[PDB]
Design a protein around this ligand. Structure first.
Ligand SMILES: *[C@@H]1O[C@H](CO)[C@@H](O[C@@H]2O[C@H](CO)[C@@H](O[C@@H]3O[C@H](CO[C@H]4O[C@H](CO)[C@@H](O)[C@H](O)[C@@H]4O[C@@H]4O[C@H](CO)[C@@H](O)[C@H](O)[C@H]4NC(C)=O)[C@@H](O)[C@H](O[C@H]4O[C@H](CO)[C@@H](O)[C@H](O)[C@@H]4O[C@@H]4O[C@H](CO)[C@@H](O)[C@H](O)[C@H]4NC(C)=O)[C@@H]3O)[C@H](O)[C@H]2NC(C)=O)[C@H](O)[C@H]1NC(C)=O
Ligand SMILES: *[C@@H]1O[C@H](CO)[C@@H](O[C@@H]2O[C@H](CO)[C@@H](O[C@@H]3O[C@H](CO[C@H]4O[C@H](CO)[C@@H](O)[C@H](O)[C@@H]4O)[C@@H](O)[C@H](O[C@H]4O[C@H](CO)[C@@H](O)[C@H](O)[C@@H]4O[C@@H]4O[C@H](CO)[C@@H](O)[C@H](O)[C@H]4NC(C)=O)[C@@H]3O)[C@H](O)[C@H]2NC(C)=O)[C@H](O)[C@H]1NC(C)=O
Ligand SMILES: CC(=O)N[C@@H]1[C@@H](O)[C@H](O)[C@@H](CO)O[C@H]1O
Ligand SMILES: C[C@@H]1O[C@@H](O)[C@@H](O)[C@H](O)[C@@H]1O
Lengths: 207, 207
């Protein structure tokens, strides 16, 4: 039968007031025999009616997928309200319900440092700039590199790793042409996290 | 019914001649009523008799698990020999077989760099030393920090990340007391990977 998964908003969306956070309910293995899936939504058990719901054909295995995207208030997520989807269909013996909310826990802002290329690497054509983001809680975070404030393309992040002390850390690696590194620049590491002032910080090199 | 999962040796075990690589066959959801699983082992279809097999209770959901651990020859894994477990039980309609072997692919040795603390961190009570390990294939790798040849305690690794070009990279973060960094030390990063001479390299500072 159909099964149901619930997904949180993207951390960047829920921390940036200008963005549009969404909680998503996905119903997989929907059948064309009973395709009229109903998804109802509740915020602390108060029903809301604004979700955008669409059916998609998954040709990988000839199934249907119903995706319901509920737009949410930033503060409702951040204050810990519960978001619940209730899934009804003619082929379900009983409704399926899923709930998600922001976990409780300590907040610790990340320490953000940018590290120059290793000296041994300076004889190469391309060099590596390292953004180190550490000592942060919870693990939800958004990290990017920018050049002149304009988001880069050739950067790669690690996933956050749990430390022994309970905080997390990650790195963002940026490969640049050595010419651009030696010449004066504004390569910067941008970090979006709950613990930061205005949920955002940037870090640049001194020279 | 019972299901069967097979697992390769740990990369450190199979690359280091002093260690003991194992291929493991796990039979999950064995029943109290028919618990007598017979597990036979084959290396390139030649039967071998050295595996150690044990039954365990899983208290999370009150089930049984049979774990069969085959000690293997390092070179047999590295040269691509196939390792096969055949699982018999009376509640099985037919035997279940699993095979595993070293995946094919290109080998590229890691570039290994050690990075000093960010200058803005040097006045704090603790500093971070970074081992940056890049440009390696396959992703299977082992990294540690040592001081005076002894393995450190307060280091944590990221999991390898796939780069655009098909290579992988990771970081190992060693946090030390700033006093110990400033005074003479021998902090070093050791990397175990198939592409390295004797599968091992080390990188130190102040050189
Ligand atoms: C036909 O083909 C279909 C297409 O492949 C296939 O659909 C797939 O079905 C599987 C289930 O069989 C389902 O798997 C789940 O995936 C969850 C993660 O989904 C993410 O990421 C994957 C890729 O990693 C994507 O494919 C998904 O689309 C989804 O992407 C996210 O989408 C949201 C909203 O669109 C975005 O906002 C995100 O940004 C985006 N992320 C990314 C990275 O892209 C995963 O969470 C599920 O795991 C949980 O359930 C399992 C049980 O099924 C457990 O084993 C597992 O441990 C997890 O358990 C949960 O654990 C929590 C904490 O540990 C608990 O709190 C929960 O209660 C617990 N849940 C349960 C149920 O126990 C799961 O692996 C795929 O998502 C789905 N793909 C799509 C595209 O729909 C069909 O199955 C095929 N059918 C047949 C008959 O063959
Ligand atoms: C009771 O509770 C126990 C304990 O939780 C539970 O046992 C687990 O059962 C699940 C299956 O239901 C097992 O899942 C597999 O895990 C594999 C990894 O296992 C390691 O890591 C986990 C933690 O991450 C440890 O718990 C574990 O001890 C090992 O260290 C994973 O590899 C498996 O995934 C493969 O198989 C599934 C199909 O089942 C498939 O969906 C995956 O995509 C993947 O498929 C394989 O893909 C490769 C390509 O990459 C392909 O080559 C290969 O052919 C595919 N193989 C198959 C079979 O498809 C899977 O997720 C888990 O290991 C069990 N844990 C333990 C500790 O035993 C019981 O199931 C519970 N029982 C009940 C009744 O509740
Ligand atoms: C990530 C993880 O859990 N890996 C382990 C693996 O090391 C072990 O060999 C296997 C056999 O039990 O079980 C699993
Ligand atoms: C200890 C148990 O082992 C396995 C998992 O599938 C369970 O969720 C739990 O982690």
């Amino acid at each position: 039968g159909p099964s149901v998964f619930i997904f949180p908003p993207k951390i960047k969306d829920v921390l940036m007031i200008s963005l549009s956070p969404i909680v998503t309910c996905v119903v997989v293995d929907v059948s064309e025999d009973d395709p009229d899936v109903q998804i109802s939504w509740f915020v602390n058990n108060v029903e809301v009616h604004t979700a955008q719901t669409q059916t998609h054909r998954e040709d990988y295995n000839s199934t249907l997928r119903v995706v319901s995207a509920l737009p949410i208030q930033h503060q409702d997520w951040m204050s810990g309200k519960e978001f619940k989807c209730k899934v009804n269909n003619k082929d379900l013996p009983a409704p399926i319900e899923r709930t998600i909310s922001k976990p409780k826990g300590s907040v610790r802002a990340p320490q953000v440092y940018v590290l120059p290329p290793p000296e041994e690497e300076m004889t190469k054509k391309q060099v590596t700039l390292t953004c180190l983001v550490k000592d942060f809680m919870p693990e939800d975070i958004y990290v990017e590199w920018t050049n002149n404030g304009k988001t880069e393309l050739n950067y790669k992040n690690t996933e956050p790793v749990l430390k022994s002390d309970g905080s997390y850390f990650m790195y963002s690696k940026l490969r640049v042409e050595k010419k651009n590194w030696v010449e004066r620049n504004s390569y910067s590491c941008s970090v979006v996290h709950e613990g930061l002032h205005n949920h955002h910080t940037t870090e640049s090199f001194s020279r």
